Design a protein around this ligand. Structure first.
Ligand SMILES: CCCCCCCCCCCCCCCCCCCC
Ligand SMILES: CCCCCCCCCCCCCCCCCCCC
Ligand SMILES: CCCCCCCCCCCCCCCCCCCC
Ligand SMILES: [Mg+2]
Ligand SMILES: [Mg+2]
Ligand SMILES: [Mg+2]
Ligand SMILES: [Mg+2]
Ligand SMILES: [Mg+2]
Ligand SMILES: [Mg+2]
Lengths: 164, 164, 164, 164, 164, 164
């Protein structure tokens, strides 16, 4: 028997599909950075894409743990070009903030149905999203300071290219 | 400057998106096996999905290596239900034979244009596909023998669930 | 279901039996050399016989990998006697060159049928044959220098006797 | 000079060719098991075939050790189809019992000629045949009990596939 | 006996002499960089020159393996000067692209003769050329970004000076 | 600024190109020993050829150390054929004696100019030339004791083929 409601199960399945799209968007940003010759930023984005797949799978295993099941939906075609490095990381921040709000909406839906197990499960993602948004804000800050200077950009590209 | 033809880039780009679809299909098979309580079969498919990502990224990196650019496309919704374990594995075999023909068509195209670099790059996929088809054919032959006997299926689930 | 044509499977199965005979021929050479007290030339021929069996088993596993089966045929009696050291090795070389041409014929047949999997599997043997032929030519060269001087042949015997 | 009679030499040379045939017979049994999809039974037979070849080379070396010469004969085409698993192993047991009687005939011939060296040398094979026949009788007993039940047959396959 | 045709042996020997010139051209680029004070760039070229010698020796050993003979020809004086760092690396890329087409020409010749051993042997060079051209394309892309800014040139020089 | 006289720089640059020719000559000799089936002698010459390049590069580095530049010149085609093993090594010895006298001429020139730094630099090559000459003479003496006995030639081929 499924002990999440269908409404909560749908919200969770929807978020899992959003996490898959996040992964794909970030790979698309890698394709841009690689085309522009910034292999470090592209590497950063490939690691981020893998990271989003772990989020997808966290939702996956929770849905099954609660007796639901996962239905994978079509993945929309992501954007594949940006007006520059900053424009790309700004889109990432905007995306991550939208993901944060999507998670908040599930949390409030679970709280209104008194699904305390799902409220509690989602705490992990609330905390993770703080980290996710702020790592992008940090990079955007460095790019605002570098102000186009290839000297600095080179070293940032190499720094982010070290992400484990 | 791009040293692959536009027609070969498009074939390689297309195949990269087929590898992503292949990854997603196998993840959908996992959602089905998990919904049916076969955590070992599902585990096997999750590993297969990750393996297909490695194929996509081999295409990714070769395209940039030849001066091209990757464009990510929409990913179609895969089926999410099969008529039992053997049906899912028959579909998987059919999918891998389709992938193999897709790979053959690029090789032949590349050969016709005398793109020896791409013909040689594609050898690795030719040899991998043979291994991929064989792995599924072997699982199918065992399930044909088992004739749905639950004790045989349980041992096969535990074995596939140990895949690294 | 078999994914090689019957024609290609027959070609491979025929070459499998050819590798078996190659093994037996070289053992027969070991019987000649062991008879003339050359225990080192005999040791080399017994190593070559064991290597031909690895060749046969490589075709074996590929045939089954592609859904065919193997049928073992009768093995013709090999020659048991040779006019001298260099008479035997020149039969070796002529045999290995016949093997190479048989391999080439399978390659061209597969290529004509667009069986890229078999064309690629055969690359391994095309490269080994280069080595198999070269090792005999080298030995014939060392013989055509020693000019029957048992002092040198005590060393040539000694050296082939060290083959691992 | 030869210090075995020609009759004892012919007896030993015949037995060497018989062990070569034994090796080929078990390899044919492997082609059957693999065709039937039992890679563990097939593995056991491949290991047997390699062992039947150590037997041949022991005769080989004794013959040269007594001043005789080996001559390799044609090898007959082995059977390639059995009715089922148990029939193949039964044919294996029948073959080993025939090999045992063949060894006995040499022993009794060497004993008549007072060739005490050959008599002593053959004790190894006598004792070894006891083990070869026993190991096949054990498998047959398990297969009799399995009574065609595929759940059990699969368990035997896996076990015999671990043979070292 | 030489088992390669004279036309193929000539093409191969010609390529070998082309690899020697390649080595010498990169040494000459080293002489230019060392004169301009870029020890790191010069170091990169000195390692590249040693790498071309391994290419030459690979060709050398294959020729003798197919019963042919190597004849060393005169080496042209390479250019001694370039109009800046980018100019040198553009010359390097143009040379490696010419080397790649030279190799392609041998492969198409060997394939027309059905000289499969040589077609197969040249695969290694087809794959290596992909990397040789791409490593130079990557250097040229960073140099474009640096745009003559010495603080970035120093960064690239010390990095290329790390090449092992 | 250059602190060697242009005359000394031209002599050093000339010798650098002479060491490059020496490397090429010794490789040509390897082409001859390999054509003749003496792989160990061929091996010795290949090792000598690499050693020759270290000599070249010691001149290279000293020229830049004194503020000069290197200019690479064309490399003449070497001979490829000797009348026998001893003929090749006699030619090697005569070449090295020529190199020794070329080095002496540079030392005498530098001495005439009171270029004490270059005089001292060249001491290394004076001592090394004594060795390079001695090792060819040792080999010629062993060839003379061998007196065409292929027994001994084979042992020297193998010994020289062990050179590190
Ligand atoms: C070099 C690092 C490469 C990272 C590749 C990241 C790829 C993410 C692509 C997103 C596509 C999603 C659709 C397939 C999902 C498969 C999930 C398998 C998870 C077990
Ligand atoms: C050193 C002795 C080698 C003699 C070979 C003679 C060939 C006769 C053919 C007999 C069949 C032998 C079967 C070989 C089985 C190999 C199975 C290995 C598993 C990979
Ligand atoms: C470590 C040395 C630094 C760079 C070496 C540069 C060589 C330039 C090209 C030389 C041309 C003459 C050919 C000599 C061939 C030597 C063969 C060696 C075989 C292992
Ligand atoms: Mg996420
Ligand atoms: Mg794939
Ligand atoms: Mg063979
Ligand atoms: Mg036996
Ligand atoms: Mg090269
Ligand atoms: Mg020198």
């Amino acid at each position: 028997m499924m002990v999440i409601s269908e409404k909560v199960r749908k919200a969770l399945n929807d978020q899992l599909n959003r996490e898959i799209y996040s992964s794909y968007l970030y790979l698309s940003m890698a394709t841009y950075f690689d085309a522009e010759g910034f292999k470090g930023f592209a590497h950063w984005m490939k690691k981020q894409a893998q990271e989003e797949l772990t989020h997808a799978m966290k939702f996956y295993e929770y849905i099954y743990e609660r007796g639901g099941r996962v239905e994978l939906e079509a993945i929309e075609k992501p954007p594949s070009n940006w007006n520059g490095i900053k424009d790309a990381f700004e889109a990432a921040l905007k995306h991550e903030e939208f993901v944060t709000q999507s998670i908040y909406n599930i949390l409030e839906l679970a709280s209104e149905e008194k699904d305390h197990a799902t409220v509690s499960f989602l705490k992990w993602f609330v905390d993770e999203q703080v980290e996710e948004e702020d790592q992008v804000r940090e990079i955007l800050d460095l790019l605002e300071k570098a102000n186009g200077q290839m000297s600095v950009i080179f070293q940032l590209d190499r720094y982010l290219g070290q992400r484990e």
